[PDB]
């Protein structure tokens, strides 16, 4: 692909144009990115896709220019999902939650990009969205049930004090406490690898891109049972699952 293309069509259905974009290989890695509007999430995810710092703005793969939307892009067998920013009242929160829950289920790791880490509102969204779950029992190959999605928090456009090692560990602790009891979300327990701070530099994204492939857990019970092309059929069965739909209705009901 030359650039990013829309992963969804109207009403949150998956576009039929991306299915021919996938391969019959089980050696794929899916990495999503979520966060508020002005965090630069699309510009940052573009350089784990392969963009250089000197490239022009028109050459960025994720150029952010229909209520919900997700942008898909694939280099090699690396699948990058760029979600629309988080931000009305019930529907603004219900939509954000609907896209976050979907991306925690179909991603190996999700990048949480913000300028507010540690931000309790972000953790609140992440911890309730994880309870929005489908029941894909009849899916074959059978899928992993105890599998945890990795989360990497990234603090963009941060000052020099946000780069203080004492400040990173202080907030990293709060992030490991925020998911110590999580069942399907995980966060690393290595210092300086759960909250990454950037002052807004290519030798960090190259190291981070090498690191996003280690703590990925397979979606299936058996190794290499799902190719990327069948990974999308899991996505289609997630948005249609009725157990997930009922849970989202009871979220919106509790918010009103």
């Amino acid at each position: 692909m030359k650039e990013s293309v829309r992963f969804l069509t109207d009403f949150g259905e998956i576009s039929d144009a991306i299915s021919d974009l996938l391969t019959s290989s089980p050696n794929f890695n899916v990495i999503s990115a979520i966060g508020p509007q002005g965090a630069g999430k699309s510009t940052l995810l573009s350089m784990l896709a392969g963009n250089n710092s000197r490239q022009m703005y028109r050459e960025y793969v994720f150029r952010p220019v229909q209520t919900i939307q997700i942008d898909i892009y694939i280099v090699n067998h690396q699948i990058f999902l760029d979600c629309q920013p988080m931000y009305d009242d019930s529907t603004a929160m219900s939509d954000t939650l609907r896209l976050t829950a979907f991306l925690l289920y179909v991603s190996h790791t999700v990048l949480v990009v913000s300028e507010t880490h540690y931000d309790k509102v972000i953790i609140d969204t992440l911890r309730v969205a994880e309870q929005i779950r489908p029941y894909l029992a009849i899916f074959r190959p059978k899928l992993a049930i105890d599998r945890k999605t990795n989360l990497v928090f990234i603090k963009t456009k941060a000052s020099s004090i946000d780069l203080a090692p004492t400040v990173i560990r202080e907030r990293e602790e709060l992030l490991r406490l925020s998911f110590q009891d999580s069942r399907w979300l995980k966060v690393s327990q290595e210092p300086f690898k759960t909250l990454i701070v950037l002052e807004e530099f290519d030798e960090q994204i190259a190291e981070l891109r090498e690191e996003l492939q280690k703590n990925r857990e397979d979606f299936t019970v058996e190794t290499a049972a799902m190719d990327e092309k069948k990974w999308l059929d899991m996505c289609r069965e997630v948005i249609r699952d009725k157990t997930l739909h009922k849970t989202l209705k009871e979220y919106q009901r509790a918010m009103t």
Binding site: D124, Q131, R133, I145, V167, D181
Partner: protein, 340 residues
């Protein structure tokens, strides 16, 4: 100092100046590295009164300090966003869950904000994110909802404490406006980094305040804004001290310091939840409890004995996140009863 402890000994620390007219000013902000909530206020007093970060024993408390040279009782709230509170919630009990652990701190934030918005002449919000925090505005709409629900019981407590006929300032308030409060506070906002800029956030600040029914709702309002005098200020890392005195000097002091001491003692019931009904869950807690009750009903439907109990367990193992150990073991008992 904690206001619960400030009251006990305030009548003796200022035994002389009990008749001095003062103001009560609330402060809302968050702690940041090398900058605490009250760093702008303690700089206004030229004395660092509040710390750069709340300690564990200062979490979820309204920190009171009375400057007798300016005749102002400043009230800074240590809320749920402090590092010491998020730490103290998520390790106070390892046998709990994230949602219930922060629910209790989220309730006390609601009571403390309820405490401030019924007893403060002004309330200043400090923001650094460059955007108005919309979850503070959901807190303030839950606070105004809880205030509406308990304003009747709090008003009779101001009647018992002899404070209902004690004037807070010039303004006369209807019984609907005054019920449960002593004041409708004037709300101010200070951003931390051009005249049309601050004017653009005033209209912004106003409209979001109306979207949550916090202003221009009559007796149902939680606060109000000034008519002519600026409500929004922009700081730089002093134009700020003049922005407060314009607001403070627009209101001659009226309430005695003594009746403020007894006001903070009277409204302790709000901080202790003495007037609320038992077992009130947060919106998130009710969402968790209702879908977990649904998961239990669907798992029982899956049972309707060996094969029937392996699909009810594997379904709850797939969908239930919190209290997963208790949910699975409590269903082993519901299928044991169905085996009869």
């Amino acid at each position: 100092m904690d206001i619960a402890k400030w009251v006990e000994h305030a009548r003796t620390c200022y035994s002389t100046q009990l008749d001095t007219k003062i103001k009560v000013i609330g402060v809302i902000g968050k702690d940041y590295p090398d900058h605490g909530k009250g760093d702008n206020i303690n700089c206004y007093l030229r004395e660092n009164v509040f710390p750069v970060a709340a300690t564990e024993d200062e979490t979820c408390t309204i920190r009171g300090h009375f400057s007798e040279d300016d005749q102002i009782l400043f009230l800074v709230m240590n809320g749920v966003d402090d590092v010491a509170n998020i730490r103290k919630c998520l390790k106070s009990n390892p046998k709990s869950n994230y949602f219930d652990a922060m629910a209790e701190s989220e309730c006390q934030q609601i009571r403390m904000l309820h405490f401030l918005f019924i007893s403060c002449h002004f309330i200043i919000i400090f923001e650094q994110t460059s955007r108005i925090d919309l979850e503070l505005m959901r807190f303030l709409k839950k606070v105004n909802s809880a205030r509406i629900q308990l304003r009747k019981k709090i008003n009779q407590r101001l009647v018992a404490s002899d404070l209902r006929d004690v004037s807070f300032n010039n303004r006369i308030l209807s019984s609907a406006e005054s019920e449960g409060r002593m004041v409708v506070p004037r709300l101010l906002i200070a951003f931390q980094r051009y005249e049309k800029l601050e004017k653009n956030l005033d209209n912004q600040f106003s409209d979001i305040l109306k979207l949550y029914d916090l202003i221009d709702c009559g007796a149902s309002s939680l606060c109000q804004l000034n008519e002519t005098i600026p409500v929004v200020h922009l700081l730089n890392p002093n134009s700020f001290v003049k922005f407060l005195e314009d607001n403070f000097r627009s209101e001659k002091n009226e309430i005695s310091l003594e009746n403020v001491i007894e006001l903070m003692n009277c409204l302790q019931c709000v901080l202790d939840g003495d007037l609320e009904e038992k077992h009130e869950k947060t919106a998130i807690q009710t969402f968790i409890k209702r879908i977990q009750n649904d998961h239990m009903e669907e798992a029982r439907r899956l049972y309707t004995h060996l094969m029937r109990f392996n699909e009810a367990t594997h379904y709850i193992d797939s969908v239930v996140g919190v209290n997963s150990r208790e949910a699975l073991s409590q269903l082993q008992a519901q299928c044991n009863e169905m085996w009869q």
